């Protein structure tokens, strides 16, 4: 009976009766967002309240609403009239994606700017890109989406090959107006096709590959029990779902002899931002929010055996609501399966005569997700040793642009006339720390070099050194690969046998943050992205490092605005945020589908156990 | 008749006869190094002349020879004398190893030493430690390991438990003299075992791993001929071994259509460096240089089927020269294999309705070492996209000292009265580029950020930069993770259908340098340590960045005296060196035999392709 259970389709459905009920999901509602509530601190409740948040929006074009609904007793919590022109708009809907194309395709300036071109408006997909928020006063409070035109020579041609370049729509999509069109300048279309399954452009496919089978003769070695929680090699874990953060972890925790210690009580990846770095008009106010404004768990896509899982699979198929409070399953949405990990550990010692080797073994728990273009891939790596590590794969195919003649200094050219502007892909991991328990703690370690003098005659020494953070205000962190900085959690009230305190170590990968402008529009709305690390105060509402409502948000909403409570820190309930991100020059090999990237993090013990952790480990 | 295939058995007789008949291979003579000499520029050369480099040590005490024969043509090519004083001593020789113990076991000073500390001589273990080049006079010239101690209290025992603090000696291995023994005070000799197979410390083996079968029913998907030539979806090279560098990796090329196209003309791990950074007299002097003083190859692994290497594997043996020439067989000292690699593409396209998926592969060459305490894999990676990775895996015991009463900046504490100093483990590796050929030049490419004002209104542009490095003296490079620096390998004269220089891009992990102060022996001796890439040259004689004798040599040799010919590299045949490596602060984790740490660099097609390379990729 857990508290961190799946939500269930009776659960939705129970929702969706209770709304109704309560005269708040007549026909002219859509939920926006429907999630599962975390339980509050202390647990000591008998009996769970399975509580869900709801944000309900108005096709009518009356207030939207924030809704809280209690499942248990079957009655709405709180209701509040939201005003986004303050707090910001609600998550894009799947139904507006193609409200975008239909309304320009009777708009005369639309048309005539096709015409110019020689285009069929038939022809003419439309991009629903989210908007942000800029010069444009008229915006202030409307639900506004920007679209770019590709062509679609036929109804399987890649309509990535054939940006329209110049050309850029603003839609109210709530009254169902065009707001602006802007035409700078007519570009030729690139007539090359990016058909990646064309054989024309594949040749003959490759005969020389052969068989690799993965198999595990008596099953696999973890545990699946109350339909989410997972045993494996000393872990254990509830694996959530959330329509827009997808996969989340909770309650990781590894079994040392006898006692269950925590480690994480939440993990997450809590927001998504893409910026473009191409200054040109058409495209200089792109910059998508997926987690915040698109919610990439609603997107994730149903996982093929032996295609994109490949081994012995358990599955999980979350369910999530559809606009209307219908449950609807992710069939097949969660790919869980351990895999082989190399040597773990080896010596062969000339003294004593023993030669010892032992493999290591990681747990995937994985979802693929699929926004326009873009589709990635989120991985949590469990290991023996007891590191833990997050991976994000990115690939589908670039956004495009045309390639301009003469160049460029902010797009790359990919075939001829076919440009692909550069950007970044940043993450943001929002991971609720309780190593043993939840008196936690952050310090900051640096490399120390030292001088060649007296105490140190031969100039070999080195060192190394440990600031803490003691309150929110000088939490805002920056990386720095040459002094190897690395950020230790630990719990300064829990010691490992040699009386130091227990610890977990973060290793980034010290990639660029946020590289524009810091008085731009992007630098205060994805605030997180501009630096490498932020340790918070645990707060219930203190979820999202970018605010509850990123859609065409003015800045300065959640960890800019958290952390200037300056709360304290040192010993305290904390929540550390790790940026992290890809900076992304497209190169010729990325067209016309692009082989996977990939960027993350780990964490790894520093002190937890008092030996290593995987002495029990048999030989196989 | 391949002349890059791996030497043989009768090769290697061949060498001890030609020097035998020679009047160089005497009973007095022992071979530090035997291998083989690659082929100079221009094969143009019908029939190959299989040529090997020896090192001959004379235990007599003669001045030691440098000798380079002919097995094609049984002759002697040229026999150089050499001043070891001025140019360094030959590699550590393995019967060498045991000859510091028992030269102290009969040293008055030693003996009073372990008596004072009431330690049974014939318990008491000494690691024989490469010496450097420090303020002993006495020592120039004259071939020195220094010692420092460990108790075993029974045959299988780990002696790496007991370290023998405030104790260190010095020997002249050729005299069989104790040149200086010093005693600096008595440390308690810690008392903990570190018995990793020892039930009482691992407690019962876990039952609950299930086994992973990894199979290829049909065979791997790579043919091997003429011993040592690799085929794999694309990719052409051919596996060599060398004693002192382990295995080498010989034209590297990708099969692109119907042309063959060079990347790699050779690629090794030329160099590695251990300095440990406690300034204690006892262990202030301790850098070895596991390449360059006691060859790596030489103490290879066999490698168990199913322990080490899990899959279809592929095994090569090489063979190497024992100290007398005979030829000595390292079974199964190399596995290849290749591997499942997860997703390598995937789209999902909302306006075409085609799904797409397909998986990655890796190509794995490896081999393993043990030098004392350390144990090191090195694994070539090859996959289906273009990709080239390096990674070592760093495992062993850590090298142990007494944990100070009172603590220590220098050294952690791993158990009670247990410490381990902290210290580096630095690579070198030696990249012989041949982009499609050897005209080739390296760019150092930096993120370019942009300053909100016209032409980037909305502050949102940003850039990058290329700086062609155009001769040896500016082409000492730093790292610099915050502006995203790396460096692309291009040729200028060979130009992708977009009319663009093709070339393959270095991605760093961007990890600390050389610690030590700029004025220690260790950054004289291990310069090329102190910055994170090199670019020379190519010339036959410049092959180890350090030098052909690291053993004792005083420093400047390699890299600094390469880099200050000053030689124009601009569209030339030329050579990157990569340093990169691991800080190792040990954790209690790493006690008593730790797990696998990594650390590497990889190299991506950058504009090499004129579209992505996996586009003929079945679905399976
Ligand atoms: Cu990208
Ligand atoms: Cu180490």
């Not at 959330?242 to 996969?247: A, L, M, P, W, Y």
């Not at 080797?357 to 699929?370: A, D, E, P, Q």
């Not at 936690?440 to 600031?467: H, L, W």
């Not at 082989?595 to 008092?610: A, C, I, N, W, Y």
Request: overall charge negative; aromatic content about 10%; charged content about 25%.
């Amino acid at each position: 009976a857990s508290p961190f259970r799946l939500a269930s389709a009776g659960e939705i459905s129970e929702v969706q009766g209770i709304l109704r009920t309560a005269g708040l999901l007549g026909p002219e509602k859509r939920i926006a967002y429907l999630g599962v509530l975390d339980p509050a601190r202390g647990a000591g409740s008998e009996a769970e309240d399975r509580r869900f948040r709801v944000f309900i929006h108005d096709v009518s074009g009356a207030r939207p609403q924030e809704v809280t609904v209690s499942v248990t007793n079957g009655t709405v919590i709180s209701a509040v009239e939201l005003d986004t022109a303050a707090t910001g708009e609600l998550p894009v809907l799947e139904e507006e994606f193609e409200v975008v194309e239909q309304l320009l395709a009777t708009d005369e300036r639309w048309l005539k700017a096709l015409a110019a071109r020689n285009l069929d408006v038939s022809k003419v997909r439309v991009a629903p890109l989210s908007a942000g928020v800029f010069e444009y006063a008229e915006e202030r409070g409307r639900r506004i989406l920007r679209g770019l035109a590709f062509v679609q020579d036929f109804p399987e041609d890649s309509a990535w090959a054939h940006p329209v370049d110049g050309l850029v729509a603003y839609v109210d999509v709530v009254s169902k107006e065009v707001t602006r069109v802007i035409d700078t300048g007519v570009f030729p279309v690139p007539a090359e096709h990016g058909n990646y399954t064309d054989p024309e452009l594949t040749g003959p496919l490759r005969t020389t590959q052969k068989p690799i089978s993965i198999t595990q003769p008596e099953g696999p070695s973890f545990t699946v029990t109350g339909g989410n929680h997972i045993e494996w090699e000393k872990w254990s874990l509830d694996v959530g779902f959330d329509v827009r953060e997808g996969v989340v972890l909770h309650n990781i925790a590894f079994r040392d002899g006898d006692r269950l210690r925590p480690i994480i009580n939440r993990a997450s990846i809590a927001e998504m931002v893409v910026p473009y770095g191409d200054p040109s008009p058409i495209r200089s106010w792109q910059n998508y929010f997926d987690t915040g404004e698109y919610l990439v768990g609603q997107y994730a896509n149903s996982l093929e055996l032996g295609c994109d899982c490949l081994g012995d699979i358990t599955y999980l198929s979350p369910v999530i609501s559809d606009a209307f409070g219908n449950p609807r399953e992710i069939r097949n949405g969660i790919c869980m399966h351990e895999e082989d990990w190399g040597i773990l550990a080896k010596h062969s010692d000339l003294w004593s005569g023993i030669n010892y080797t032992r493999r290591n073994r990681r747990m995937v728990i994985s979802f693929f997700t699929t926004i326009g273009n873009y589709d990635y891939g989120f991985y949590w790596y469990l290991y023996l040793d007891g590191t833990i590590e997050f991976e994000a794969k990115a690939t589908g195919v670039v956004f495009t642009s045309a390639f301009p003649e003469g160049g460029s200094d902010n797009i790359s050219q990919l075939a001829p006339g076919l440009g692909a502007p550069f950007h970044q892909h940043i993450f943001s991991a929002r991971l609720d720390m309780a190593i043993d328990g939840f008196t936690n703690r952050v310090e900051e370690e640096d490399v120390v070099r030292q001088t060649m003098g007296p105490g140190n005659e031969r100039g070999n020494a080195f060192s190394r050194k440990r600031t803490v953070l003691t309150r929110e205000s000088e939490a805002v962190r920056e990386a720095d690969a040459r002094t190897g900085r690395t950020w230790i959690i630990s719990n300064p009230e829990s010691k490992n046998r040699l009386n130091e305190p227990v610890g977990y170590k973060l290793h980034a990968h010290n990639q660029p943050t946020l590289l524009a402008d810091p008085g731009s529009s992007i630098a205060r709305r994805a605030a997180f992205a501009t630096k490498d690390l932020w340790v918070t105060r645990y707060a219930d509402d203190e979820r999202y490092p970018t605010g509850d409502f990123v859609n065409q948000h003015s800045g300065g909403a959640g960890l800019p605005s958290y952390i200037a409570q300056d709360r304290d820190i040192d010993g305290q309930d904390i929540v550390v945020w790790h940026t992290f991100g890809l900076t992304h020059f497209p190169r010729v090999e990325d067209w016309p589908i692009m082989p996977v990237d990939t960027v993350g993090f780990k964490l790894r013990p520093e002190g937890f156990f008092d030996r290593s952790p995987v002495l029990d480990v048999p030989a196989n």
